[PDB]
């Protein structure tokens, strides 16, 4: 079927956040920001995205949260630029995960991401 799944609320999506050491990549039309100042932390990825045919189709927004609740990373579609495919998001998520792991951070994803996006 088709279902638009959401892990984050309006506040988590609109929340302001800061990067002391901002590292940014641009995969296709997807921007992957992360704070390289985060080391030895437990971080969880939360994503709002659409699904068709039990497959990830379009990412609305993904954000990384510490156990306390501070946003230290983000995967977002770039404004004023064309869309993307499911494989683009699948690769961007792995990019962010590797960037967090290099800083000795263990990364976990929600039950929603693990069913349609995996690692």
């Amino acid at each position: 079927a088709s279902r638009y799944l959401t892990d984050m609320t309006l506040e988590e999506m609109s929340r302001d956040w800061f990067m002391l050491m901002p590292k940014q990549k641009v995969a296709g039309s997807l921007c992957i920001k992360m704070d390289q100042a985060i080391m030895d932390k437990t971080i969880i990825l939360k994503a709002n995205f659409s699904v068709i045919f039990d497959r990830l189709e379009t990412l609305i927004l993904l954000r990384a949260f510490t156990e306390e609740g501070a946003i230290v990373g983000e995967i977002s579609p770039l404004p004023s630029l064309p869309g993307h495919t499911g494989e683009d998001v699948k690769n961007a998520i792995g990019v962010l995960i590797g960037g967090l792991e290099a800083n000795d951070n263990t990364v976990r994803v929600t039950e929603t991401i693990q069913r349609f996006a995996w690692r």
């Binding site: 088709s2 279902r3 638009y4 959401t6 309006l10 506040e11 999506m13 609109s14 929340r15 302001d16 921007c31 709002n48 659409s50 609305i60 927004l61 977002s76 579609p77 770039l78 404004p79």
Partner: protein, 144 residues
């Protein structure tokens, strides 16, 4: 100026989309509460008519154990009234089931537009956030 006017216009359109989603979800909540209420009523009526079925099964077993005057003829009339009341209760039960199905129809006719509005609202919010709109301006556009 131009580039700021466009951001403000996209914020206004986000406000429009968010209010539309609020209205649609309000309507859907109304219909869902009505659906749950009528489903509970249908379950109650099912239990009642099932008790009726049990009693009339006793009636079958006790009517086959006879094979005059008025020792039995006085019962076999009010008990036919009870049969008629059972079938009338079911005539109400199925009539309510039809309305419940129509409510389900109306809700499933809303689900597509509801999901589309929610997704496009979140997308406009993400766009404005990427254009440098702080959380205070986003909440201004949303309303609260």
């Amino acid at each position: 100026g131009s580039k700021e006017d466009s951001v403000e216009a996209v914020g206004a359109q986000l406000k429009v989309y968010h209010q539309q989603y609020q209205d649609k979800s309000r309507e859907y909540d109304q219909l869902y509460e009505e659906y749950t209420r009528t489903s509970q009523e249908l379950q109650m009526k099912r239990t009642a008519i099932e008790a009726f079925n049990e009693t009339i099964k006793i009636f079958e077993e006790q009517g086959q154990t006879q094979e005059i005057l008025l020792n039995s003829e006085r019962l076999k009339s009010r008990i036919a009234e009870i049969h008629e009341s059972r079938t009338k209760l079911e005539q109400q039960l199925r009539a309510q089931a039809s309305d419940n199905r129509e409510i389900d129809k109306r809700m499933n006719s809303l689900k597509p537009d509801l999901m589309q509005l929610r997704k496009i609202r979140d997308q406009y919010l993400v766009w404005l956030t990427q254009k440098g709109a702080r959380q205070k301006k986003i909440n201004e556009w949303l309303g609260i």
